Amino acid sequence: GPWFTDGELDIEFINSLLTIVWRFISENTFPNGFKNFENGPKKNVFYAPNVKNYSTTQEILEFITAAQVANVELTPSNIRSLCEVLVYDDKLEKVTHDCYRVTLESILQMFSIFNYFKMFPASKHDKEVVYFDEWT
Amino acid sequence: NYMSNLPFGLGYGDVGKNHITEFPSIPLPINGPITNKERSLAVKYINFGKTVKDGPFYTGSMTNDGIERYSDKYLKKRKIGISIDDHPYNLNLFPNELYNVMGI
Amino acid sequence: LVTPEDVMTISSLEQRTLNPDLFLYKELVKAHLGERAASVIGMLVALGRLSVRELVEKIDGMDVDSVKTTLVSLTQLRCVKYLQETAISGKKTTYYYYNEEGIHILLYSGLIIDEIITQMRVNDEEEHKQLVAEIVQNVISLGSLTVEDYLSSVTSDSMKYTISSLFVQLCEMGYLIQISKLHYTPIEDLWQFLYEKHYKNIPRNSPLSDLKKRSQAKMNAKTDFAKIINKPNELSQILTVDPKTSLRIVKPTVSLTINLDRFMKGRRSKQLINLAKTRVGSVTAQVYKIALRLTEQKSPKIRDPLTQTGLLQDLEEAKSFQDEAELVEEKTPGLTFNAIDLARHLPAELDLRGSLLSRKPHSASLINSHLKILASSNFPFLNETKPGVYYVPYSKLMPVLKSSVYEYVIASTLGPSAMRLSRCIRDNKLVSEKIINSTALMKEKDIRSTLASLIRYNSVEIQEVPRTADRSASRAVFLFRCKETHSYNFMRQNLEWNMANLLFKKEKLKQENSTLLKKANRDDVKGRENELLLPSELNQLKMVNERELNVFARLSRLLSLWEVFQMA
């Protein structure tokens, strides 16, 4: 496929493909997408359990076909390969029947371990600093 | 002669210096800004330990003149420490060998 | 170029060779009790089982009385376990273990009293906060704090009535458990003492064989050991007695010692709540805070019911203990709650009106909706046995929680492509040099750079594929493996060593600032520190005080990382 190109894996190209597949899921899963998270954590709305908020591979294929962002046709196996590539990096969750969900993507983009972007290093020449590789 | 073993992904400039960084450096994000709750945790922490050291549970210690100054006569005692045997304890939770140190 | 004299002083190389298990506890006892106590505990850690004479002949303190006093101090501090094993053909001498969970009391002390303060339903009264803080501080600093001592201590009766009032509540939460012989003896030795009586209770010439007598002995041992651990793990017999024309009272004779099991259950619930806050928006995350708050009180054992540390797990048919743990998890009816049960404990602040949207006032139907989304969520927070009532499982949530927290610590340490390769090697089992390219599709350069940077830890395993009979990894391509066990092992060691580094730093700062600290911690000086102090000295005191505050903040922020790897 187009991923193979000149013996190189198209750093600026595959990165751009990986950042469009989860974006639709972020605006298709929530009742308001990401603007539901713009009013604050204490004002967002969540869908009922019975509703089918999950996304199927057919709708994602229709997106990736109508958008014309890659200029290349995609096999269903190719879209499955893309979403297997991006299932990592904390992008999309695995649930049965090839469906996806995001939980803290907006918090990531904008001790409470699972988000450290609100906690900055010591940023000083002081002492008592901790390093994860000091023991090895 | 061991000088020609070089992978194509490895150049010549990098090798030779070695010597490593003196301490490995990865700034851990557990040193974030302090809040009032964190300052309170620090304060209660320093109260603790200090409480057990000002108490009778030190057991850590390993002007000593044989002649007493008259200033030392009718002078205040430092502190009448509560001995380890002085504080009551429960015999059912201490071994028999530890009973002798205690005041029965 | 750095000098060898320059390193090993500001580099802390010589502290890298101490085992973190010994270094951490040695440093803790050094900070809290004293250097003789710390030396004794270090000898106990290095030599797991030894008697008093072993201490005399190993520690430079060649004195029976001094060792006796230090050992009794450590035993009072719940930092030492003891046993009396009898040699029939002569004289018996008692041996000495070291208490592992006991030292967490002094270590977790700050988090302990903080959860005590913030956990009470009625905390808005300042005087009550101070009373509960002082009482729990006295209990953790003294060990077995006792009513016959404290009531005699307090000089006015009306403030003595409140002390007994708080005791019954504090025991019902489990924060004050009755100490006994079960809290000073090793688990394997208890299991053996309950395994050798039953091997001795069988009369001879029974038609059953060795296998059947072994099975009956082991099941009887399991049942009576379970009874003996269940009786004192949760009880109210000390609180049962009620005198005439008086309120409910505890036994004043018994010694009340602070527990750790329910507090650490609360700490696990708190970390799961923070996980939910990081995972789900605050509208329906707010309801999850009190959702686990009604099960944490009677929550099951976190890692091992102490039936897995006292004996070999199993050789053949080894799934039985996981099966029985999940059997208890599903058989407990108290833990399971319905929506009607939860509505009686929901705070008035939370509305639960806009928390749902069916299509693209404390109502049990809407609480049921959050409970259903929780049960059907990707992480198994709840499992449904019957419609409307579910429960929190631990036979399938602990592995995913450990994998998530470990893998995200790798996320916080290493970079994005390293996170990607970690995720790939986790989800795709037994990756290879071509499978990484087939399942990654990013730049191999950064892929193998971060891979090599990650080989250092116990994260991934390296395999060898011998193309011939003899094994050379330079002749043939080799593939990878996961072995998540070693990865979980590393997160223990590294975190405890970093902790011990924190305590070493603070205690060394104390050792170089002891005169100023002693001048500070004087009764008349306390509260008056800007008048009777020279300028440079007082400014230095502020700098060192804030430095200690920073080290304590770092300690507390690290204190949310090792317990989650301290599970099973």
Coordinates of N, CA, C and O in Angstrom, one line a residue, chain C residues 449-524:
Chain C
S449 N 15.4 3.0 18.7 CA 16.0 3.8 19.7 C 15.3 3.7 21.0 O 15.9 3.5 22.1
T450 N 14.0 4.0 21.0 CA 13.2 3.8 22.2 C 13.2 2.4 22.7 O 13.1 2.1 23.9
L451 N 13.2 1.4 21.8 CA 13.3 0.0 22.2 C 14.5 -0.2 23.0 O 14.5 -0.8 24.1
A452 N 15.7 0.2 22.5 CA 16.9 0.0 23.2 C 16.9 0.7 24.5 O 17.4 0.2 25.6
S453 N 16.4 2.0 24.6 CA 16.2 2.7 25.8 C 15.3 1.9 26.8 O 15.5 2.2 28.0
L454 N 14.4 1.1 26.3 CA 13.5 0.4 27.2 C 14.0 -1.0 27.5 O 13.4 -1.6 28.4
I455 N 15.0 -1.6 26.8 CA 15.5 -2.9 27.2 C 16.1 -2.8 28.6 O 16.2 -3.9 29.3
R456 N 16.6 -1.7 29.0 CA 17.3 -1.5 30.3 C 16.4 -2.0 31.5 O 16.9 -2.7 32.4
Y457 N 15.1 -1.7 31.5 CA 14.2 -2.0 32.5 C 13.8 -3.5 32.4 O 14.1 -4.2 31.4
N458 N 12.9 -4.0 33.3 CA 12.4 -5.3 33.2 C 11.1 -5.3 32.4 O 10.3 -6.2 32.5
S459 N 10.9 -4.3 31.5 CA 9.7 -4.2 30.7 C 9.5 -5.3 29.7 O 8.4 -5.9 29.7
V460 N 10.5 -5.6 28.9 CA 10.4 -6.6 27.9 C 11.4 -7.7 28.1 O 12.4 -7.5 28.8
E461 N 11.2 -8.8 27.4 CA 12.1 -9.9 27.5 C 12.7 -10.2 26.1 O 12.1 -9.9 25.1
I462 N 14.0 -10.6 26.1 CA 14.7 -10.9 24.9 C 14.8 -12.5 24.8 O 15.1 -13.2 25.8
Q463 N 14.6 -13.0 23.6 CA 14.6 -14.4 23.3 C 15.8 -14.7 22.4 O 16.3 -13.8 21.7
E464 N 16.2 -16.0 22.4 CA 17.2 -16.5 21.5 C 16.7 -17.6 20.6 O 16.1 -18.5 21.1
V465 N 16.9 -17.5 19.3 CA 16.4 -18.5 18.3 C 17.6 -19.2 17.7 O 18.3 -18.6 16.8
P466 N 17.9 -20.4 18.1 CA 19.1 -21.1 17.5 C 18.8 -21.7 16.2 O 18.0 -22.7 16.1
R467 N 19.4 -21.2 15.1 CA 19.2 -21.8 13.8 C 19.8 -23.2 13.8 O 19.2 -24.1 13.0
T468 N 20.8 -23.5 14.5 CA 21.4 -24.8 14.7 C 21.2 -25.3 16.1 O 20.5 -24.7 16.9
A469 N 21.8 -26.5 16.3 CA 21.6 -27.1 17.7 C 22.2 -26.2 18.7 O 21.6 -26.0 19.8
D470 N 23.4 -25.7 18.5 CA 24.1 -24.8 19.4 C 23.4 -23.4 19.3 O 23.0 -23.0 18.2
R471 N 23.4 -22.7 20.4 CA 22.6 -21.4 20.5 C 23.5 -20.2 20.4 O 24.3 -19.9 21.3
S472 N 23.4 -19.6 19.3 CA 24.1 -18.3 19.1 C 23.0 -17.3 18.6 O 22.4 -17.5 17.6
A473 N 22.9 -16.2 19.3 CA 21.9 -15.2 18.9 C 22.5 -14.2 17.8 O 21.7 -13.4 17.3
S474 N 23.8 -14.3 17.5 CA 24.3 -13.5 16.4 C 24.2 -14.2 15.0 O 24.5 -13.7 14.0
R475 N 23.8 -15.5 15.1 CA 23.7 -16.3 13.8 C 22.3 -16.1 13.2 O 22.1 -16.1 12.0
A476 N 21.3 -16.0 14.1 CA 19.9 -16.1 13.6 C 19.1 -15.0 14.3 O 19.4 -14.5 15.3
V477 N 18.0 -14.6 13.6 CA 17.1 -13.5 14.1 C 16.4 -14.0 15.4 O 16.0 -15.2 15.5
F478 N 16.3 -13.1 16.3 CA 15.6 -13.4 17.6 C 14.3 -12.5 17.7 O 14.3 -11.4 17.2
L479 N 13.4 -13.0 18.4 CA 12.1 -12.4 18.7 C 12.0 -12.0 20.2 O 12.9 -12.3 21.0
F480 N 10.9 -11.3 20.5 CA 10.7 -10.7 21.8 C 9.7 -11.6 22.6 O 9.3 -12.7 22.2
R481 N 9.4 -11.1 23.8 CA 8.4 -11.7 24.7 C 7.9 -10.6 25.7 O 8.4 -9.5 25.7
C482 N 6.9 -10.9 26.5 CA 6.3 -9.9 27.4 C 6.8 -10.1 28.8 O 7.4 -9.2 29.4
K483 N 6.5 -11.3 29.4 CA 6.8 -11.6 30.8 C 6.6 -10.3 31.7 O 7.5 -9.7 32.3
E484 N 5.3 -10.0 31.8 CA 4.9 -8.8 32.6 C 5.3 -8.9 34.1 O 5.3 -7.9 34.8
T485 N 5.6 -10.2 34.6 CA 5.9 -10.3 36.0 C 7.2 -9.5 36.4 O 7.2 -8.8 37.4
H486 N 8.2 -9.6 35.6 CA 9.5 -8.9 35.9 C 9.2 -7.4 35.8 O 9.8 -6.7 36.6
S487 N 8.4 -6.9 34.9 CA 8.1 -5.5 34.8 C 7.4 -5.0 36.1 O 7.8 -4.0 36.6
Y488 N 6.5 -5.8 36.6 CA 5.9 -5.5 37.9 C 6.9 -5.5 39.0 O 6.8 -4.8 40.0
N489 N 7.8 -6.5 38.9 CA 8.9 -6.6 40.0 C 9.7 -5.3 40.0 O 10.1 -4.8 41.1
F490 N 10.1 -4.8 38.8 CA 11.0 -3.6 38.8 C 10.3 -2.4 39.5 O 10.9 -1.7 40.3
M491 N 9.0 -2.1 39.2 CA 8.3 -1.0 39.8 C 8.3 -1.0 41.3 O 8.2 0.1 41.9
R492 N 8.3 -2.2 41.9 CA 8.6 -2.2 43.3 C 9.9 -1.7 43.7 O 10.0 -0.6 44.3
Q493 N 11.0 -2.3 43.2 CA 12.4 -2.0 43.6 C 12.7 -0.6 43.3 O 13.3 0.1 44.2
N494 N 12.5 -0.1 42.1 CA 12.8 1.3 41.7 C 12.2 2.3 42.6 O 12.8 3.2 43.1
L495 N 10.8 2.1 42.8 CA 10.1 3.1 43.6 C 10.5 3.1 45.1 O 10.7 4.1 45.7
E496 N 10.8 1.9 45.7 CA 11.2 1.9 47.1 C 12.6 2.4 47.2 O 12.9 3.1 48.2
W497 N 13.5 2.2 46.2 CA 14.8 2.8 46.3 C 14.8 4.3 46.2 O 15.5 5.0 46.9
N498 N 13.9 4.8 45.3 CA 13.8 6.3 45.2 C 13.2 6.8 46.5 O 13.7 7.9 46.9
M499 N 12.3 6.2 47.1 CA 11.8 6.6 48.4 C 12.9 6.6 49.4 O 13.1 7.7 50.1
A500 N 13.7 5.6 49.6 CA 14.8 5.5 50.5 C 15.8 6.6 50.2 O 16.4 7.2 51.1
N501 N 15.9 7.0 48.9 CA 16.8 8.1 48.6 C 16.2 9.4 49.2 O 16.9 10.3 49.7
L502 N 14.8 9.6 49.1 CA 14.2 10.7 49.7 C 14.5 10.8 51.2 O 14.8 11.9 51.7
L503 N 14.3 9.7 51.9 CA 14.5 9.7 53.4 C 16.0 9.9 53.7 O 16.3 10.6 54.7
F504 N 16.9 9.4 52.9 CA 18.3 9.6 53.1 C 18.6 11.1 52.9 O 19.4 11.6 53.7
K505 N 18.1 11.7 51.9 CA 18.3 13.1 51.7 C 17.8 13.9 52.8 O 18.5 14.8 53.3
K506 N 16.6 13.7 53.3 CA 16.0 14.5 54.4 C 16.8 14.2 55.7 O 17.0 15.2 56.5
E507 N 17.2 13.0 56.0 CA 17.9 12.7 57.2 C 19.3 13.2 57.2 O 19.8 13.6 58.2
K508 N 19.9 13.3 56.0 CA 21.2 13.9 55.9 C 21.2 15.4 56.0 O 22.0 16.0 56.7
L509 N 20.1 16.0 55.5 CA 19.9 17.5 55.7 C 19.7 17.7 57.2 O 20.2 18.7 57.8
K510 N 18.9 16.8 57.9 CA 18.8 16.9 59.3 C 20.1 16.8 60.0 O 20.4 17.5 61.0
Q511 N 21.0 15.9 59.6 CA 22.2 15.6 60.2 C 23.2 16.8 60.1 O 24.0 17.1 61.0
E512 N 23.1 17.6 59.0 CA 23.8 18.8 58.8 C 23.1 20.0 59.3 O 23.8 21.1 59.3
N513 N 21.9 19.9 59.7 CA 21.1 21.1 60.3 C 20.6 20.8 61.7 O 19.6 21.5 62.1
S514 N 21.2 19.9 62.4 CA 20.6 19.4 63.6 C 20.6 20.5 64.7 O 19.7 20.6 65.5
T515 N 21.7 21.3 64.8 CA 21.7 22.4 65.8 C 20.6 23.4 65.5 O 19.9 23.8 66.5
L516 N 20.4 23.8 64.3 CA 19.3 24.8 64.0 C 17.9 24.1 64.2 O 17.0 24.8 64.7
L517 N 17.8 22.9 63.9 CA 16.5 22.2 64.1 C 16.2 22.1 65.6 O 15.0 22.2 66.0
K518 N 17.2 21.8 66.4 CA 17.0 21.7 67.9 C 16.7 23.1 68.4 O 15.8 23.2 69.3
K519 N 17.3 24.1 68.0 CA 17.0 25.5 68.4 C 15.6 25.8 68.0 O 14.9 26.5 68.7
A520 N 15.1 25.4 66.8 CA 13.8 25.7 66.3 C 12.7 25.0 67.2 O 11.8 25.6 67.7
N521 N 12.9 23.6 67.4 CA 11.8 22.8 68.1 C 11.9 23.0 69.6 O 12.0 22.0 70.3
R522 N 11.9 24.2 70.0 CA 11.8 24.5 71.5 C 10.5 25.2 71.7 O 10.0 26.0 70.9
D523 N 9.9 24.9 72.9 CA 8.6 25.4 73.2 C 8.4 26.9 73.1 O 7.5 27.4 72.5
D524 N 9.3 27.7 73.7 CA 9.2 29.1 73.7 C 9.5 29.7 72.3 O 9.0 30.6 71.9

